[PDB]
Amino acid sequence: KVYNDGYDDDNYDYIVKNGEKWMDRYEIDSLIGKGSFGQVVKAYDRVEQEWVAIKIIKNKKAFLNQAQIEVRLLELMNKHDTEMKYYIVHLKRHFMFRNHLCLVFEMLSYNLYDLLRNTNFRGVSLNLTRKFAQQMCTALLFLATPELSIIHCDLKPENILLCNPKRSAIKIVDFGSSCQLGQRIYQYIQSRFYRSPEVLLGMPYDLAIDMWSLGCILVEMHTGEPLFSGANEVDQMNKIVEVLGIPPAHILDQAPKARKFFEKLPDGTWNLKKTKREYKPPGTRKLHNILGVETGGPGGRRAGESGHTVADYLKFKDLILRMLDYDPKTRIQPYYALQHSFFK
Ligand SMILES: FC(F)(F)Oc1cccc(-c2cnc3ccc(-c4ccncc4)nn23)c1
Ligand SMILES: [Cl-]
Numbered sequence: 356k357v358y359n360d361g362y363d364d365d366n367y368d369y370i371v372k373n374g375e376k377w378m379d380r381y382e383i384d385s386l387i388g389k390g391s392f393g394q395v396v397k398a399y400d401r402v403e404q405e406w407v408a409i410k411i412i413k414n415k416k417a418f419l420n421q422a423q424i425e426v427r428l429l430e431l432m433n434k435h436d437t438e439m440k441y442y443i444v445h446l447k448r449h450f451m452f453r454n455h456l457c458l459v460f461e462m463l464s465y466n467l468y469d470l471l472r473n474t475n476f477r478g479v480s481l482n483l484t485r486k487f488a489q490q491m492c493t494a495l496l497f498l499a500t501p502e503l504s505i506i507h508c509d510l511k512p513e514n515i516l517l518c519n520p521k522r523s524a525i526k527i528v529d530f531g532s533s534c535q536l537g538q539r540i541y542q543y544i545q546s547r548f549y550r551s552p553e554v555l556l557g558m559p560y561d562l563a564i565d566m567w568s569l570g571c572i573l574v575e576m577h578t579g580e581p582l583f584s585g586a587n588e589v590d591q592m593n594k595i596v597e598v599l600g601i602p603p604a605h606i607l608d609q610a611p612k613a614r615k616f617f618e619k620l621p622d623g624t625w626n627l628k629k630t631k632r633e634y635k636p637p638g639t640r641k642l643h644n645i646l647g648v649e650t651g652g653p654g655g656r657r658a659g660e661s662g663h664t665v666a667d668y669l670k671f672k673d674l675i676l677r678m679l680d681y682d683p684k685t686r687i688q689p690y691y692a693l694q695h696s697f698f699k
Contacts, residue, residue, distance in 0.1 A: 359414055359453065359454055360453075362453050362454075363414050366413070367393075367413040367414045367415040367418070368389070368393055368394055368411070368413055368414075369393075369394065369411050369414070369453065369455050371383065371385075371386045371394060371396055371411070373385050377398075377409075377452050377457075378450065378452065380400065380401050380402055381398040381399070381400055381401070381407070381409060381459075382398060382399040382401060383396055383397075383398050383409075384396075384397040384398060384399065384406075385397050387408065390529075391418075392410070392412055392413060392418055392421065392422065392529070392531050393410065393411050393412045393413040393418060393455070394410075394411045395408055395409070395410050395411070396408070396409045396410075396411055397462065400459070403447075405462075406462040407447065407459050407460065407461070407462055408459075408460045408461070408462045408463065409457050409458070409459050409460070410422075410457065410458040410459075410460060411452075411455050411457050412455055412456040412457070412458070413455075414454045414455050418531075419456055421531040421532070422456045422458065422531060423456070424530070424531065424533070424534070425458070425529070425530040425531045425533070426446065426449055426456075426458065428505055428530045428533050428535075429443075429445075429446035429458075429530060430446065431503065431505075432497075432503065432505070433445070433446065435497075435500060435502065435503060436497065441493060441494060441496075441497035442490045442491070442493055442494040442497075442524075442525060442526050442527060443494060443497065443498075443526060443527050444460055444461060444463065444516065444526045444527065444528045445460065445461045446458055446459070446460055447459045447460065447461065460528075463516040463517065463518055463519075463526060463528070464516060464517040464518060464519050464520050465516065465517060465520070466512060466513045466514070466515060466516050466517070466528075467487070467512035467513070467515045467516075467517070467525070467572070467576060468511075468512040468513045470512075470517065471512065471575070471576070471579055474579060475579075476579035476580060477579050477654075477656055478576065478577045478578050478579040478652075478653055478656070479576055479577065480577075480657075480662060480663070481577060481652070481657070481662060481663050481667055481668070481671065482662045483523060483576075484573055484576050484577045484671070485671075485697060485698065486523045487515075487523070487525055487573065487576060488569075488573050488674070488697070488698075489693070489698055490524070490525050491510075491515070491525070491527070491569050491572075491573075492569070492689045492692045492693045493689070493693065494526075494527050495562070495565055495566065495569065495689040495692075496689035496690055496693065498562065498565070499562050499688070499689055499690075503535070504535050504536040504537075504562065505530070505533055505534070505535055505562075506533060506534055506535070506536065506560075506561065506562050506564060506565060507527060507530065507532075507533050507565050507568075508532045508533050508534060508544050508545055508564065508565070509529065509532040509533070509544075509545060509546055509549075510527070510545075510549060510565050510568035510569060510572060511546045511548070511549045511568065511572065512572060512575060512576070514527060514528055514529050515527060515528070515572070516528050532544065536561060536562070540559055540560065542554075542557055543588075545564060545568065547585050547587075547588070547591050548571065548581040548582075548583055548584055548585065548591075549567070549568040549571050549572065550568075550585075550588075550591060551563070551564040551567035551568070551683070552567070552592070552595060552602055552606075552681055553683055555588055555591065555592050555595075555612065555616075556602075556606070556607070556610035556611070556612050556613060556616075557610060557611040557612035558606075558609065558610055558611070560683065561683060563683035563686045563688075564683070566678050566686050566687065566688070566689070566692070567678065567679060567686065569678055570675050570678030570679045571583060571679075573671075573675060573678075574642070574645065574646070574675055577646070577652070577653060577671075578645065578646070578653040578654075579653070582598070582645070583595050583598070588615070588616075589615065589616055589630065590632070592616040593616070593627065593632075593634045594634070596627060596634070596637045596638070597634055597635045597637070597638075597639065597640040598638070598640045598641070598642055598645070598679075599638060599679060599681065600637045600638030601617070601625055601626070601627070601637050601638075602617075602625075602681045603681055603682065604624075604625055606681060606682065607625045613625075614628075615628075616628060642672055642675065642676065643672060646668055646671065646672055647668075648665060648668040648669060648672060649665060651663075652668070667697075670695070670696050670697040671697055673695070673696075673697070674687070674692065674695045674697045677692070677695070678692070
């Protein structure tokens with residue numbers, strides 16, 4: 356019958372019903388949320404006797420194909436992360452159910468965007484930020500293992516989950532957009548706020564694009580707001596240039612999409628194309644002041660508060676700037692990010 360025998364909605368999602376029992380094994384409790392891939396559902400595994408989160412993929416070839424890549428990437432991670440000490444959500448198994456691929460995960464709590472909303476977008480503390488930063492650098496270290504070389508390609512606050520509302524532990528979720536070094540190279544990957552300059556410029560990219568995203572995420576987690584909130588690629592590039600200046604000439608010379616944001620003057624120098632919206636001149640929106648290094652943190656909301664010293668902010672800003680290096684050949688890599696003084 357049409358609509359998968361009446362089991363699916365107009366968006367190829369399985370219509371979730373509380374209390375349903377799948378495979379005479381999973382007792383579905385309730386829907387947790389939806390994403391572009393489909394839905395995540397809270398369930399009780401009768402066999403293992405534990406709560407699980409089941410990701411129900413949309414009943415559509417394009418989404419099924421992405422989930423098949425995710426399964427392959429998580430299974431290859433499990434072969435190297437059997438202790439699970441590396442901070443990636445753990446896939447327990449998968450199965451097909453009513454023409455939906457279902458991935459069974461350990462149950463986690465809500466995501467880092469939800470954590471910001473509980474904060475009313477005032478940000479979490481610098482100490483909590485440091486703890487988040489340390490775990491994500493360790494995760495990026497694990498993904499950089501040569502036999503893995505996995506690029507997540509969609510790091511953002513909604514793709515990082517707390518294990519538990521009362522603890523600082525986090526895990527990275529959702530590898531449906533992910534890939535390994537040496538596969539297809541795409542335009543328009545990564546969520547726009549977190550999209551690296553390499554990808555905007557249509558250049559080849561590697562694991563460093565996740566570090567760029569990480570840098571943007573960490574500032575957001577403390578300020579409460581995206582660092583670079585582009586409405587489109589040109590706005591996105593221009594907002595990056597406000598904080599970090601014009602990209603180096605050697606990179607723009609190599610960039611296939613450079614002329615979409617920049618032009619060369621007769622003397623050979625690269626300048627922003629003018630499109631209305633007017634931007635701060637390049638490099639004048641100093642991150643020193645977005646973080647309010649000498650002025651009580653973002654918006655002054657940390658004035659008079661311990662664990663927020665000027666030296667802490669100077670170390671934080673230094674680490675962030677290394678993560679937002681324009682050149683992916685020198686952008687700080689996970690191993691050395693973990694030796695930065697912000698963590699000592
Ligand atoms: F927003 C939606 F994701 F739809 O629903 C949500 C929203 C807030 C949390 C979760 C949640 C709780 N415990 C887990 C474990 C894994 C996963 C996951 C794995 C792979 N890909 C995506 C998610 N999610 N999850 C799912
Ligand atoms: Cl600065």
